[PDB]
Write a protein that binds this ligand. Structure first.
Ligand SMILES: N#Cc1nc(CCCN2CCCCC2)cc(C2CCCCCC2)n1
Length: 213
């Protein structure tokens, strides 16, 4: 009763957003990449920078919503690849070119708010899902091993965007496998296991969505 999409080729390497508020763009490109692999049998790194620069409804390096990024890729008729529109860590003018186009989107669906059952179904039936969490605690930041649970985590304080790449159980502890964008150096090779079915720990199911392809 588990899945790990890193084993299935749905997940690109861990990235480092640096000192830009673009976690949302990495979340979005990660969910898009998964769907590229689901639909086509192959994926590639997609461009966070395209999103930071071209999604005007978001705040570039000052934050943004994944749903807005998916809406943008749909309306735009594409998103460039990372290699075609590479990541520079700051907002620049929108320089999207359809010649670099690597993925398309025909909408998105939002998981019902606070429902981890629905989220589990979504991860099983779609693949990697974009989620948002309270990552503000010192204990999240210094995570290294095991299943992260902190009683101080605030589910109404969503301040960081990440990506659910699977679920399972470790040492009796149900978990979400979370891909972050703080470099491979952070956590466990850029990954964190977060508590699953512990009353929506850190608001994991409060802002969950995936792109349609
Ligand atoms: N990276 C990323 C990222 N950075 C910010 C900027 C805040 C900077 N802030 C400055 C003071 C210290 C704490 C961080 C906001 C968000 C999103 C949160 C998750 C869901 C809703 C969408 C917005 N993500």
């Amino acid at each position: 009763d588990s899945v790990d999409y890193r084993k299935k080729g749905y997940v690109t390497p861990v990235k480092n957003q640096g000192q830009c508020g673009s976690c949302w763009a990495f979340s979005s490109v990660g969910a898009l990449e998964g769907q590229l692999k689901k639909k086509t049998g192959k994926l590639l790194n997609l461009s966070p920078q395209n999103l930071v620069d071209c999604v005007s409804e978001n705040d570039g390096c000052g934050g943004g919503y994944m749903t807005n990024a998916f809406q943008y890729v749909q309306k735009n008729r594409g998103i460039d690849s990372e290699d075609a529109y590479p990541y520079v860590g700051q907002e620049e003018s929108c320089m999207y070119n359809p010649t670099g186009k690597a993925a398309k989107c025909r909408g998105y669906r939002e998981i019902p708010e606070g429902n981890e059952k629905a989220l589990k179904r979504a991860v099983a039936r779609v693949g990697p899902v974009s989620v948002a969490i309270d990552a503000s605690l010192t204990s999240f930041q210094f995570y290294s091993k095991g299943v992260y649970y902190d009683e101080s985590c605030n589910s109404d304080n969503l301040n960081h965007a990440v990506l659910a790449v699977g679920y399972g159980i470790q040492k009796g502890n149900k978990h979400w496998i979370i891909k972050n964008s703080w470099g491979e150096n952070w956590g466990n090779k850029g990954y964190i296991l977060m508590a699953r079915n512990k009353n929506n720990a850190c608001g994991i199911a409060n802002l969950a969505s995936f792109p349609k392809m």
